[PDB]
Design a binder for this molecule. Structure first.
Ligand code: NI
Ligand code: NI
Ligand code: NI
Ligand code: NI
Lengths: 833, 140, 140, 833
C-alpha cells in the first residue's frame, strides 16, 4: 500500500468516525469527541467521492449533526471541525464553522457511506437544557487612563491599502499617510490592544491617539523618531519627516486633552466588558466555570493595566519597538512569556503574564516593554529573543504531582504527562509481582536501572525502596543507591518492628516514609501502628483503606498530627458503581472466591461504604491532604486531576460553602495534587506551584476542558507534550487531534528539562555521575519535621472514631454520612470510551 | 618609550644587525590604549559602556609592533573566540575617533599590554621527529 | 586565523620570547617566584600557564588530519577533545606560492669540487666566527 | 488478547480493507492502495475460514477486483498483492499475481464477510482509457563489442543439473562439464548480464563465449586459472585441469572470431531494446514518464558498456572474482553501490552506477571489477566489502530540502523524510503561538534545546532566530547561540528599520535572512521594503504573498536582482479549490469574521487569483527559484515534492515547450527543492544534488510513483526510512507495506548520518561541544554575495507590475493569466485519504 504516516492516521480518524456512526445509528446523543470524528470522517469520504468542492463541504458540514443528535454541552464545545483530504485537485483543507447549525441535522447524510440503517428522530432522547463559561461583571473599561491625548485627521494618499496596529508609533507610519506628524509624535492609536485601523486608498479618518508610556522611547518603524520623546528629538523627527517626504499637513486646530476617568470625554476609548474577557480572557471580578463541573473561579487580582495587554499576532502588541523591547540588556530578555494567563494555584487565582527564563518561572505580573508601557519591571521584559505562549482565554496550573506511582509499564508515563502530570514518585521495576503489589524498587541495581531507563523522559522522577525491615542494614544500602523515600507495605510485612526500624532510618537520611498498613491486624490494630510511629512524620497512602490498611479503621490516621495523609483516586468520590467495582477488584487482586465464607468476610471488611463516604468528607474538610493515583495497582494514572475535581464538584453540591465563588474550595483541592505532594516528598522548592524560582512545569487548559483534557504541557520551560493534529496539514488543528509528545520529549531534551530526585546520601556520592545520567539530579529534604499543619489548605485534625461493626465514622462528634452520586462531570462529555 | 615605536621608527632585532621600520601606525596620537591606574582603559573612558555585549573583544593586545610576512606595523590586536578578530585602532567609540565596531574594548575584555613589545605569529615547525614529549615543551 | 601569538621584547627577539598565546589564551610564559608579591622575582623561567592545564590545551588547538580521516570522524572515534580539521589545497602549489621565497635559479653542482652555480653565478660564502642570539642569552 | 505486533498491524490492514470495501459498495472505482488493502484483507479472512488452500487463494485473488472496479492506472500499478495469514496449518504466504485478471471481477466475493450490500455493475462509472511508462527506442543492442570470441560444445556428464552465470569464468566450471577447457580460458558466456545457461544432466549445448575485459585477471571459482590471462598461466591452468580431473575434450575445429559491430556475425549476442530497459532500466534515448504526470525524462547519457551491467543476485554479475573485485586495495572498495540508476538532478538526467564511501557520494559512472571489465576507474570498484542497492528500473534524486519549516510538532519530521525530504531549515520551539506564526526559535536556550532535541533524527537541520529588531544587540546573541539564519516576520514587526538592522547583521555573520513582509503596508509599501534591502541578498518567503506580504504586490520581488525568492506549496498550482480554501484558511489563522466589512477586505486583499495565477507562470519562467512547505503554518510538509511536479505538469500542458522531451523543465523544477534551497541557505557543498563529494542523501523512486511516494531514503550512505511490509513475513513485501524508519533512524545512527547547520560564529565557540551533540555540526557560508543569477536554472528577472485594483500582474510587458486546473496528478491515484 505504501502508506505514508498521514494515511495511517486518517485510517484511525476514519475508524473513530465509524464508531461514532454506529453510536448515532443507535440513537445515542454524541459528545464532543464523537461529533468531531464523525464530521471529519464524512468530509474525507465526500472528498474521496470527488463530486463536491471545498465551499460545498463548508456548507454541507454544518448540516450533518443537529442539536437533536448531540449532548447539551456540544453546541458550545464544537466551535468547528477541520480536516484535509485528497480532492481531485490535490489536498485541500475544509473548515466546518459551528457544525451544529440546526435542530435536526440530516441523519441520512451523517451516515451516508457507512451502510448503517438511518435511525428516525424519535429514537433519540429529548433535548435537555456551558462548560468553562465566563461570567463577565456588567459594564465597560476605559483604556489607557492618565495619558496625554489627541484626535487627528488622517488621509491615505497612497494607491494601496494601509492598516495600522494599536501599538505602532504613529509618527512612524507609511509616508503616504498625511496628518499632523508633529502632533502624532510619541503617540499611538487609542484602540483595544491588538487591533488596527484600516485605511483604504483615498480614505479619511478621524483617529483617537494616546501617548506611549513607561520611559517613552521610540524605536523601529522607519527610524523617523528614534529616541526618547522630548522637545529636542521632536525637532529631529520633523527634520526627517520633511527630508524623507513623509506626508505632513499641520492641523493647528486639533483637539488636545488627556484620557480622564469620567463619562463622555472624546479622547477616551472603552471596551465592553464581555468583549474584554473574550479578547484577553477574564479580569478582576469575572468568574470561570471549571470544565463542566459546578465550580467557579473568580479572578482575585489582575496585573494588567487596561490597554497594554501582551497579545502577539499580525498588527498586534508584541512587535519590535512596541510591546517587544529593543535596547534593554540582552541577558534579561525572557526566554518565554505566557501572556494573559488565568493562574489557578493554591496561593491564589489571578490574572498575570508569566515569564520563563532558564527553565524556571522568572516572574509573574505585567509584562512588556518598559520603553513604551507603564508598569513593566526589569524582570518582565519581552525582548527580541522571547518566545510567546498565548494564554489569553486559558487557565495555567502547576504540573500535577503523583506521589503513589507503581512503575508497572512505561505507558503509565505517557498517560500521566498527557493528563497534566509532570512529576511521578513511587517504586517498581516493571510488571513483576512485587511492583504490581507495592511501590518498591527493591535492589540498588534496579535503582540504577530505573533512573537510567527514565532518563530521557520529560518528567521529574523519584524512586522508593523497600522499607520493610526489622534491621537497618539493607535500608542504608537502598538509600545510598538513590532511593528518595521508602515504602512500608503489608505484602512485605508492615509490622511495628519494621515500622520503627524504617522511620529511624528516615530520621537519619531525611527521606519520606510511605506506608500501607497491616490490613489483617496480624500484629496490632491501628492503635499499635500509630504507637510504632512514635510521633515521627509518615505519609499514609490511601488513608481511607479500600486500597489497604487496618480493617476497618485505618482512616483514624487523618487525625494524627505527625501523619500526612493521601487518598488514591478510584474511591473518589463515592458514586453508584464504586462499591460493586471495588469488592470485585479486591477479589481479583487478592485471588479470592465469592463462594468461600472468609474470603467474602475479608473483602467486606476492606471495602466499606461508611469509610468511603467519610473520605469524601475529610477530603473536603482538608483532613486528607493529597490525592494520588495508585497507577495500575488499584488506581488510575490519568485521573489524579479529574478525580480531584470530581470530588470537589460533589462536595460543593452536597455541603455548605467554604468561605459568591468557589475560590476557597478550588485552592484547597488544587493543592492536593500540586504543592502537597511536593512538600510531603521534600522537593517543594523545585516544583508543585506557579511561583517564581521553581521549574516552569506548567499545564495550559481551556476552561471548557479544565480537569479533563489539557492543551499543552510545558516541562521546564519548553513544550513537552500537547494536542496536535495532522502533521501534513496547513495548520496544527485539523484532525485527528490527539495528545502527542513534542520537541521536549525527543532525543536529549527530556533530560535537560527535568529532575531526578534522590536522597542526599546518594547525591553525596554523585550517583548522577556514577549512573551516567543526563537528567539533572537533586536531593529531597525537609521531610522529618513536617506535621499535618504543613499541608497547604489541608491541615484539619478531627478526632476520629470508627464503629468496629457498623463501620460508621465520627469526626469531632459528627457522624459522617454522604450520598451515593449517580453521575460525575469530566467524563461523558469528554471521552470516546 | 611610553607606547612603543611609531611610523618611521626602527627597531633592532635582538642583538642582530637587523632593523625593522614601522611601516604604518593605526594610532591616533593621544588616544593610545594603555591600561592601569588612572590610565585609559577604564569604565566609560577607553573602556566602552553600552555597546552590544556580544561584540566586546575577549582580549585586546595593545600597542603591538607586528612583524609578519605581510607587513611591519603598529596596531592594536583584538581577539575573539580564540581567533584574531581585528587589527587596527581599538577602544571606545563613545569617546574616541576612529574605533570601528570590531575593535571595542568593553567591560568583558582582557588586556595584554603590547606597548614596547613585538608580536609575531606562533612558529610552525614542519620537520618534527616525535622522539620525546620534552621536545614539545622546548618548542612552545 | 587562530590567535597563536608570541610576544617578544625587542632586546630578546629571536632568542627568548616573553609569552605564548595559544588560541587567545596564554599557554606558556616567563614566570618568576610563585610565592612572591609580583611575577618578576627570581627564578624567572618559561613555565606552562593556564592554557596548558587540564582540558585547556585541547580547547585552544587543532589536530590536523587528512579529509578522508575527517570524513570518518576520527575525532569522534579517537575520543579527542582537541578540535580536528582537515589539511587541503596542497596539490596545486608551486614554488611561486611560497610568500617572499619564490626564486627559481638554474642550479648546477660540480660533481668533484661540489661548487654550486646559481643562474651562472658561483656561490661562495665566508665562514662566520660568531652568531648573535647566543652568548648574550644562554646559561649553557 | 496477548496481541503480538503483527496482530496489531494486521488489524490496521484489515481496517483499510474494510474502508476500501465501503468505498467499493458505493460504486467508487478503487485506486492502487485501495485495491491492495481490499485483496490482502479478503485473503486473510479466507484463511481465517480454513476452507481454502494457498493454491486456491492464488487463483481466487485474481478474481475479486476486475477492470471495471478500478481506476485506469491500477491494472499497471498492481503487479500483485501479498499477505500472510494463519491457515489451519500455520502461517503461509499468499501471492496474488496480476490481481486485475478480468473485466468484471466478482463483487459478491470481494465483499464477502463484510456484510455490506453487494453493488450492481451499473453503479460503477464506465472505463476510461500508464504511470512511469518507459518509452523504448526501437531496435536491438549488440553486447560486449570488440572482444575475442568462440563457440564451443559443452556436455553435462554429471548426474545433477549444472547452471552457469553470465560472468562466471568458464574454465572454472564444475569438473563434470566437458568442453575444450583451453579454448574456454579467459572466456565467459556471451549472454545478457545476470542470466545463465542451464545444463540438465546429459545435455549438449553450443555456447557463445566472449573474452573477459579490463586487466583480464581470473580469480575464484576452483582456482584452476588463478592469475592474469597469458600464454604462461594458460599452460598452468591446463596442468591443473589434467591433474584435478576437470572435464576436457579438445575441439580442434571450434569457430573463433570476435564480437564485430555488424549484422549476422554468429559470435555476437543482441538484446532486444524494450527487454534491456526492463532488465536494466532505460538507456540513452529512452524516456520515462514521471509518475502519472505528463512529464517525460529522456536519458541524456549512459555510462554502461553494454553487456557488463552491475546486477546482483544468484548467478548474477556481482560475485567473487567476476563483477565483484578481488585483490584491489581494500581501502578503496565502495561501501555501497547503487547499480543502474536513472539520476534526475538539476545537472543532468543520466544512467550511471553511484558509489558511496564514508557517507559521501564517491563516484558516478560505470562501476564493477577492473580485473574483468573494461571502463572501470579506481574509484568505482565493487569489492568484497561493498553493499548493493539495486537501482535498475528506478529513479534516484537528491534528498529534498525544505527551507520554510515551522517546528510545530515532531511528527512534521517523519512526514518529511517519508515523502523524500532529508534537510529541514526553519525555526520554532514546538506548538506555541510564536512558532505557529513564524519560523523563529527566539531564545539561545531554545536553540540549544532544539539542536539537542533533534540530535538523533536522521535529517540535516538548520534553526533560525528572530530577526525582528531595530538594534543588533540580541541578534548577535541568537547567532552566537547557533542560529544559521534569521527570520523577519511581520507578526514580530517587519519594518524598514528592522529590515536594515537585520541585514546589516547578516553581512557580518554570513547567514541568510528570510523575510515575510509587512502585509498591512503599515510602515511602507513594497517599494519601501525593497529600498530597505539596500541591494543586499535576502530570501523572500512565499513571494506570491497569499502566505504573507505587502498587499497586493509583494510578488514584485521576483524581479529584484538581490532577492532570492521562494513559494510555499499550498497555492501550487492554481486549481479549482485553491481560492476558496485560502480565503477560509486566512480567516481562520487571522481570527476574522465573514460578516465584518474590513475583515473581508483584508482577506480579499491577501488571497488573489491574479497573483496566484502569476505565480504558476513565474515558477515556470524560472522567476521564482524555490518551492518550500510552510509546514503547518499555511503549508504542507509532505507535499514539497508533489506540488513542484504538479506545478510542472500544469505548465507543460498550458504553455510552450521550454527547450522531444521535458528535460529542461524537469531539471528547472527539481532544482527548486534540491540545489536552490542549499545555495540560498549556504550549505550547497554538503547537500542538494547528486554530485561527487556531497552527502549521500539520496531518494530511490519507482517511476510509476515518482513525486508521490518514494521507496527508500538513504541518509548519508545508509537506508534511513523505507517502505516496509510485515516484519514477521518471509519477505519484506507482504502487507501492510508502509513507510517506516529503518536502521539509520535508531539509537545513535541518525546523528552519525546527518548534519546540524549553525553560524560560523557558533561553531567558532564549538557549540557542538557545548551542547553535547552527537550529530556532525557545520557552518553555513557563502550567502551574502548571492543574486537571482546564482539560482540554478531559475535566474529570470522580469520587470513586474501589479495593478493595485485589478491585481493583474504584468511581467516584461505581458499580462499573466492562467487557467484554473480542475484536477492534478500525484493525488487520487496514490492516497488513501
Ligand atoms: Ni497500598
Ligand atoms: Ni499502591
Ligand atoms: Ni510567512
Ligand atoms: Ni511560515
Amino acid at each position: 500500500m505504501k502508506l505514508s504516516p498521514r494515511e495511517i492516521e486518517k485510517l484511525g480518524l476514519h475508524n473513530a468516525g465509524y464508531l461514532a456512526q454506529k453510536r448515532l445509528a443507535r440513537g445515542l446523543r454524541l459528545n464532543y469527541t464523537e461529533a468531531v470524528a464523525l464530521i471529519a470522517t464524512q468530509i474525507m469520504e465526500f472528498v474521496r467521492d470527488g463530486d463536491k468542492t471545498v465551499a460545498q463541504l463548508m456548507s454541507i458540514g454544518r448540516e450533518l449533526l443537529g442539536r437533536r443528535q448531540v449532548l447539551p454541552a456540544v453546541p458550545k464545545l464544537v466551535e468547528s471541525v477541520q480536516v484535509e483530504a485528497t480532492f481531485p485537485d490535490g489536498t485541500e483543507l475544509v473548515t466546518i464553522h459551528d457544525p451544529i447549525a440546526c435542530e435536526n441535522g440530516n441523519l441520512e447524510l451523517a451516515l451516508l457511506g457507512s451502510f448503517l440503517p438511518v435511525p428516525s428522530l424519535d429514537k433519540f432522547t429529548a433535548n435537555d437544557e456551558i462548560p468553562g463559561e465566563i461570567i463577565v461583571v456588567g459594564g465597560n473599561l476605559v483604556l489607557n487612563d492618565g495619558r496625554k491625548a489627541v484626535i487627528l485627521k488622517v488621509v491615505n494618499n497612497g494607491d494601496r491599502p494601509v492598516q495600522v496596529g494599536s501599538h505602532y508609533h504613529f509618527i512612524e507610519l507609511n509616508p503616504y499617510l498625511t496628518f499632523d506628524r508633529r502632533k502624532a509624535y510619541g503617540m499611538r492609536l487609542n484602540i483595544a490592544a491588538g487591533n488596527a485601523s484600516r485605511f483604504e486608498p483615498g480614505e479619511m479618518k478621524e483617529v483617537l491617539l494616546v501617548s506611549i508610556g513607561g520611559n517613552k522611547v521610540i524605536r523601529g518603524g522607519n527610524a523617523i523618531a528614534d529616541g526618547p520623546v522630548n522637545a529636542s528629538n521632536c525637532i529631529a523627527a520633523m527634520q526627517a519627516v520633511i527630508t524623507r517626504g513623509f506626508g505632513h499637513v499641520e492641523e493647528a486646530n486639533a483637539a488636545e486633552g488627556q484620557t480622564g476617568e469620567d463619562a463622555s470625554c472624546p479622547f477616551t476609548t472603552v471596551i465592553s466588558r464581555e468583549e474584554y474577557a473574550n479578547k484577553y480572557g477574564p479580569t478582576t471580578g469575572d468568574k470561570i466555570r471549571l470544565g463542566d463541573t459546578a465550580l467557579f473561579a473568580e479572578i482575585e487580582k489582575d496585573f494588567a493595566i487596561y490597554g497594554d495587554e501582551c497579545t502577539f499576532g499580525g498588527g498586534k502588541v508584541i512587535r519590535d519597538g512596541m510591546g517587544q523591547s529593543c535596547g534593554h540588556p540582552p541577558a534579561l530578555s525572557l526566554d518565554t512569556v505566557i501572556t494573559n494567563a488565568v493562574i489557578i494555584d493554591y496561593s491564589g487565582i489571578i490574572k498575570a503574564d508569566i515569564g520563563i527564563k532558564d527553565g524556571l518561572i522568572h516572574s509573574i505580573g505585567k509584562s512588556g516593554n518598559p520603553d513604551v508601557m507603564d508598569g513593566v519591571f526589569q524582570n518582565m521584559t519581552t525582548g527580541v529573543n522571547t518566545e510567546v505562549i498565548a494564554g489569553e482565554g486559558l487557565i495555567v496550573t502547576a504540573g500535577a504531582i503523583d506521589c503513589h506511582v507503581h512503575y508497572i509499564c512505561p505507558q503509565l508515563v505517557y498517560e500521566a504527562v498527557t493528563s497534566g502530570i509532570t512529576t511521578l514518585v513511587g517504586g517498581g521495576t516493571g510488571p513483576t509481582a512485587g511492583t504490581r503489589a507495592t511501590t518498591c524498587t527493591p535492589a540498588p541495581i534496579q535503582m540504577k536501572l530505573m533512573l537510567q531507563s527514565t532518563d530521557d523522559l520529560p518528567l521529574n522522577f523519584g524512586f522508593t525502596g523497600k522499607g520493610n525491615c526489622a534491621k537497618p542494614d539493607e535500608l542504608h544500602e537502598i538509600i545510598k543507591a538513590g532511593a528518595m523515600g521508602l515504602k512500608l507495605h503489608e505484602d512485605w510485612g508492615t509490622t511495628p518492628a519494621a515500622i520503627d526500624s524504617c522511620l529511624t532510618i528516615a530520621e537519619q537520611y531525611d527521606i519520606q516514609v510511605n506506608i500501607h498498613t497491616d490490613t489483617l491486624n496480624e500484629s496490632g490494630f491501628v492503635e499499635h501502628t500509630i504507637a510504632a510511629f512514635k510521633g515521627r512524620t509518615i505519609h499514609t497512602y490511601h488513608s481511607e483503606g479500600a486500597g489497604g490498611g487496618h480493617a476497618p479503621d485505618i482512616i483514624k490516621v487523618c487525625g494524627e498530627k505527625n501523619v500526612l495523609p493521601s487518598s488514591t483516586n478510584p474511591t473518589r468520590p463515592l458514586t453508584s458503581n464504586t462499591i460493586d467495582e471495588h469488592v470485585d477488584m479486591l477479589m481479583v487482586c487478592h485471588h479470592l472466591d465469592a463462594n468461600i465464607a472468609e474470603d467474602v468476610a475479608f473483602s467486606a471488611s476492606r471495602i466499606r461504604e461508611a469509610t468511603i463516604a467519610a473520605e469524601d468528607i475529610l477530603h473536603d474538610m482538608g483532613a486528607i491532604s493529597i490525592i494520588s493515583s495508585d497507577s495500575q495497582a488499584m488506581g488510575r494514572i490519568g485521573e489524579v486531576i479529574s478525580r480531584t475535581w470530581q470530588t470537589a464538584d460533589k462536595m460543593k453540591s452536597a455541603r455548605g460553602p467554604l468561605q459568591a465563588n468557589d475560590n476557597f474550595r478550588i485552592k484547597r483541592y488544587v493543592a492536593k495534587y500540586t504543592i502537597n505532594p511536593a512538600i510531603a516528598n521534600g522537593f517543594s522548592q523545585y516544583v508543585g506551584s506557579v511561583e517564581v524560582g521553581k521549574l516552569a512545569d506548567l499545564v495550559m487548559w481551556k476552561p471548557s476542558f479544565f480537569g479533563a483534557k489539557p492543551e499543552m504541557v510545558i516541562k521546564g520551560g519548553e513544550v513537552a507534550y500537547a494536542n496536535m493534529g495532522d502533521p501534513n496539514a496547513s495548520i496544527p488543528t485539523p484532525e485527528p487531534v490527539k495528545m502527542r509528545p513534542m520537541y521536549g520529549a525527543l532525543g536529549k531534551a527530556g533530560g535537560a528539562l527535568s529532575i531526578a530526585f534522590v536522597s542526599k546520601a546518594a547525591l553525596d556520592q554523585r550517583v548522577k555521575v556514577l549512573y551516567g545520567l543526563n537528567k539533572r539530579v537533586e536531593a529531597v529534604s525537609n521531610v522529618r519535621k513536617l506535621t499535618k499543619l504543613d499541608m497547604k489548605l489541608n491541615d484539619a485534625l478531627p478526632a476520629i472514631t470508627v464503629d468496629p461493626d457498623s463501620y460508621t465514622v465520627t469526626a469531632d462528634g459528627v457522624v459522617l454520612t454522604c450520598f451515593v452520586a449517580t453521575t460525575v462531570p469530566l467524563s461523558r462529555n469528554y471521552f470516546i470510551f | 618609550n611610553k607606547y612603543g615605536p611609531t611610523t618611521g621608527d626602527k627597531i633592532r632585532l635582538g642583538d642582530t644587525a637587523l632593523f625593522a621600520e614601522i611601516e604604518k601606525d593605526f594610532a591616533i596620537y593621544g588616544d593610545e590604549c594603555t591600561f592601569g591606574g588612572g590610565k585609559v582603559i577604564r569604565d566609560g573612558m577607553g573602556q566602552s559602556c553600552g555597546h552590544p555585549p556580544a561584540l566586546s573583544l575577549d582580549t585586546v593586545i595593545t600597542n603591538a609592533v607586528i612583524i609578519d610576512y605581510s607587513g611591519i606595523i603598529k596596531a592594536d590586536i583584538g581577539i575573539k573566540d580564540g581567533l584574531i578578530h581585528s587589527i587596527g585602532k581599538s577602544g571606545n567609540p563613545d569617546v574616541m575617533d576612529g574605533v570601528f565596531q570590531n575593535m571595542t574594548t568593553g567591560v568583558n575584555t582582557e588586556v595584554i599590554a603590547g606597548e614596547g613589545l613585538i608580536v609575531t605569529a606562533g612558529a610552525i615547525d614542519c620537520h618534527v621527529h616525535y622522539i620525546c614529549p620534552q621536545l614539545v615543551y622546548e618548542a612552545v | 586565523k587562530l590567535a597563536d601569538l608570541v610576544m617578544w621584547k625587542p632586546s630578546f627577539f629571536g632568542a627568548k620570547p616573553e609569552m605564548v598565546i595559544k588560541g587567545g589564551e596564554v599557554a606558556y610564559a616567563n614566570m618568576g617566584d610563585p610565592n612572591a608579591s609580583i611575577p618578576t622575582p627570581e627564578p624567572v623561567k618559561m613555565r606552562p600557564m593556564y592554557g596548558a592545564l587540564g582540558k585547556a590545551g585541547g580547547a585552544l588547538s587543532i589536530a590536523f588530519v587528512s579529509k578522508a580521516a575527517l570524513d570518518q570522524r576520527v575525532k569522534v572515534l579517537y575520543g579527542l577533545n582537541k578540535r580536528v580539521e582537515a589539511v587541503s589545497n596542497v596539490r596545486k602549489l608551486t614554488k611561486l606560492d611560497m610568500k617572499l621565497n619564490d626564486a627559481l635559479p638554474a642550479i648546477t653542482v660540480d660533481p668533484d669540487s661540489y661548487t654550486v652555480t646559481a643562474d651562472g653565478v658561483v656561490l661562495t660564502c665566508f665562514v662566520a666566527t660568531t652568531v648573535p642570539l647566543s652568548r648574550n642569552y644562554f646559561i649553557f
